[PDB]
Amino acid sequence: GPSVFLFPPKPKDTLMISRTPEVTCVVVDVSHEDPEVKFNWYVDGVEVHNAKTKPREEQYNSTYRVVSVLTVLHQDWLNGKEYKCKVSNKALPAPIEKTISKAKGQPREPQVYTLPPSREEMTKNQVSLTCLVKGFYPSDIAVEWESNGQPENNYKTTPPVLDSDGSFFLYSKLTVDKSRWQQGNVFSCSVMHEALHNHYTQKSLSLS
Amino acid sequence: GPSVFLFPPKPKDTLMISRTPEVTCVVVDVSHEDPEVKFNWYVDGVEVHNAKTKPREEQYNSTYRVVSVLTVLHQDWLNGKEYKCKVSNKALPAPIEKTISKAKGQPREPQVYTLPPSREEMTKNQVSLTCLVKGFYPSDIAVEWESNGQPENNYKTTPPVLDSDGSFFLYSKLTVDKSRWQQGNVFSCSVMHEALHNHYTQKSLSLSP
Ligand SMILES: *[C@@H]1O[C@H](CO[C@@H]2O[C@@H](C)[C@@H](O)[C@@H](O)[C@@H]2O)[C@@H](O[C@@H]2O[C@H](CO)[C@@H](O[C@@H]3O[C@H](CO[C@H]4O[C@H](CO)[C@@H](O)[C@H](O)[C@@H]4O[C@@H]4O[C@H](CO)[C@@H](O)[C@H](O)[C@H]4NC(C)=O)[C@@H](O)[C@H](O[C@H]4O[C@H](CO)[C@@H](O)[C@H](O)[C@@H]4O[C@@H]4O[C@H](CO)[C@@H](O)[C@H](O)[C@H]4NC(C)=O)[C@@H]3O)[C@H](O)[C@H]2NC(C)=O)[C@H](O)[C@H]1NC(C)=O
Ligand SMILES: *[C@@H]1O[C@H](CO[C@@H]2O[C@@H](C)[C@@H](O)[C@@H](O)[C@@H]2O)[C@@H](O[C@@H]2O[C@H](CO)[C@@H](O[C@@H]3O[C@H](CO[C@H]4O[C@H](CO)[C@@H](O)[C@H](O)[C@@H]4O[C@@H]4O[C@H](CO)[C@@H](O)[C@H](O)[C@H]4NC(C)=O)[C@@H](O)[C@H](O[C@H]4O[C@H](CO)[C@@H](O)[C@H](O)[C@@H]4O[C@@H]4O[C@H](CO)[C@@H](O)[C@H](O)[C@H]4NC(C)=O)[C@@H]3O)[C@H](O)[C@H]2NC(C)=O)[C@H](O)[C@H]1NC(C)=O
């Protein structure tokens, strides 16, 4: 029989009013003989009807892939509402259901410190700009880097890591060439989390 | 039938001459019909005989679970020598064999920087010391913090995360009382990795005015 997976919205989507968060429901390993699937979508247990269903698309292993997309309201997602995808296929007796929701737990505000490169690193032609984000709950978060209004490029972020006090931290690392840093250019770490004011904060860092 | 699980040594003990790395081979799901099982260790395809096998200890489901440990040579594990465990029970036609080895790939030596806590943070009870370890391959590594000889309690470490050049990096965060930091206590981040000189390096951090 098939398998079904249910993806949450992109954190930034739910956290920013201008964007548009969606819950996604994809079923894989569907037949060729009876390959027609029926979605049923439920919010806090009451069925809903605005879901957009894509028509099935075959993959290389010749199994189809069918996804349904549900727009959610920001406040509903952040207020804990359960979304439940219920998928029916006639190569299944009992239809299978999955439910997702926002990470449960009491929200805690992240502290955001920017840390300049180690003096020892100034021997290389790349330096590391560090953004420490700690003390946040739940784990759903978004961290970006930018400079003079524009998305900075060479960066990479660690997964959230459970801290000793039950909360979460992460580090994000931006690699820039030494010259830019030494010039005096200003870089900024932008964080997006439900426990921040406006769901958004920014901390800047430049050579002094 | 029965089952077999093969545990690598733990990085730090392959990496320290003075410590003792061991490959362990545990068999579970014994039969009570035939509870006798015998090992044969092959280092890179050659039978080995300095293996130790602790006796047969029965667990609550009524199965037995027995394990052989094999002390390995550091240089052998680190030189990519295959380690094969061949376990036989008359509750299974063909005997069962499993093999593991350290992860393959060109080693790359990490760089180790220590980052003092933000000034923004100095308005707190606890501050954060940061250890950046980047450029290392493969990912098997150990990071530890210490102060005046003894280890440190309050620290966590990120999983290695793949960087854009194919190497790995991570961060270790140590949280200490602002008061200890401000007295001028010195804190060390020590790293163990096979591409380091002597498998070990250390960077220290302490207050600067
Ligand atoms: C035929 O091929 C198709 C097509 O797949 C494609 O083709 C093949 C040949 C290869 O090239 C594939 O690499 C390629 O994807 C096969 O379809 C695939 O089937 C497998 C397994 O059936 C699925 O694996 C699952 O992957 C997802 C995570 O995948 C996301 O991220 C991937 C990044 O690598 C990306 O490739 C995926 O598309 C998907 O991306 C998301 O996309 C959505 C919508 O497009 C988007 O909103 C998001 O932005 C994006 N998200 C991310 C993060 O990128 C995941 O669902 C699965 O993980 C579960 O299962 C694992 C088994 O335990 C486990 O590791 C996980 O923890 C998790 O386990 C479950 O977790 C929770 C609790 O934590 C719980 O609900 C469950 O109980 C628990 N356990 C189980 C058993 O479920 C899994 O890793 C592929 O995603 C899928 N392909 C696509 C495109 O989705 C098909 O299988 C082949 N047919 C056969 C074999 O017959
Ligand atoms: C009856 O009971 C006994 C035990 O008795 C007790 O009584 C009953 C009532 C219950 O309460 C029991 O829970 C209880 O323990 C059962 O014995 C158990 O059997 C199961 C399955 O047969 C084993 O599960 C496997 O676990 C290991 C990983 O285990 C390590 O980590 C655990 C941490 O939670 C820990 O419990 C283990 O002891 C072990 O710890 C290691 O210890 C060594 C030496 O002591 C030490 O060096 C290490 O430091 C330490 N390591 C760690 C990490 O802590 C693992 O082998 C299995 O995972 C495989 O399978 C999963 C499914 O895919 C997958 O998630 C994994 O990735 C992995 O998958 C395999 O991986 C590779 C490829 O990546 C490859 O080899 C395989 O192809 C691949 N796939 C498969 C399918 O294997 C699995 O999770 C228990 O370990 C074992 N108990 C003990 C104590 O070992 C017995 O099963 C019961 N009988 C029944 C149910 O009939």
Q: In sequence order, what DSSP letters do the residues of B47-87 get, joined into one string?
A: EE---EE---EE-TTS-EEEEEEEE--HHHHHTT--EEEEE
Using CA atoms, how far apart are residues B159 and B200, in angstroms rounded to an integer? 19
To the nearest whole angstrom, how far is the Cα of A67 from the nearest Cα of chain B? Answer: 30
Phi, psi angle pair for A65, to nearest 5°: -140, 125
What is the Å distance from ligand 2's center to B59 Cα? Answer: 13
- Residue B40 · residue B46 · CB < 8 Å: no
The experimental method behind these coordinates is X-ray
Using CA atoms, how far apart are residues B111 and B200, in angstroms rounded to an integer? 12
- Residue B52 · residue B68 · CB < 8 Å: yes
Residue B16 corresponds to which tokens in the numbers above?
Answer: 């320290």
Q: Could you count the other beta carbons within 10 Å of the beta carbon of residue A102?
A: 21
Widest CA span in chain A: 68
- Residue A148 · residue A185 · CB < 8 Å: yes
Alpha helices, DSSP H only, in chain B?
Answer: 11-15, 74-78, 178-183
Which among A118, A164, A171 has the least Cβ separation from residue B158? Answer: A171
Question: Position B173: which residue type?
Answer: K
Task: Please provide the distance, in angstroms rounded to a whole number, between the alpha carbons at the two ends of chain B.
Answer: 66
For residue B125, the number of C-alpha atoms closer than 13 Å in the C-beta half-sphere is 0
To the nearest whole angstrom, how far is the Cα of A14 from the nearest Cα of chain B? Answer: 26
Residue A48 corresponds to which tokens in the numbers above?
Answer: 């809903």
Question: Position B183: which residue type?
Answer: Q
Q: Kindly state whether B157 is in contact with chain A, defined as any CB-CB distance less than 8 angstroms.
A: yes
Residue among B159, B153, B122, B154 nearest B140 (CA): B159
Closest atom of ligand 2 to CA, residue B63: 1
For residue A198, the number of C-alpha atoms closer than 13 Å in the C-beta half-sphere is 6
Domain definitions of chain B by residue range:
2-101, 102-207
The secondary structure of residue B138, as a DSSP letter, is S
Task: Indicate whether residue A31 lines ligand 1 (CB < 6 A).
Answer: no
Using CA atoms, how far apart are residues A34 and A25, in angstroms rounded to an integer? 19
Residue B128 corresponds to which tokens in the numbers above?
Answer: 């954060």
Chain mean position to CA A18: 16
Using CA atoms, how far apart are residues A16 and A77, in angstroms rounded to an integer? 12
Q: Kindly state whether B139 is in contact with chain A, defined as any CB-CB distance less than 8 angstroms.
A: no
Stated in angstroms to one decimal place, the resolution of this structure is: 2.4
Question: Position A110: which residue type?
Answer: P
CATH architecture of A102-207: Sandwich (2.60)
Phi, psi angle pair for B56, to nearest 5°: -95, 115
Q: How far is CA A204 from CA A48, A149, A159, B87, in A?
A: 44, 12, 22, 60
Which among A113, A120, A121 has the least Cβ separation from residue B118? Answer: A113
∠ CA(B2), CA(B5), CA(B1), 5° rounding?
10
Task: Indicate whether residue B100 lines ligand 2 (CB < 6 A).
Answer: no
Phi, psi angle pair for A83, to nearest 5°: -110, 130
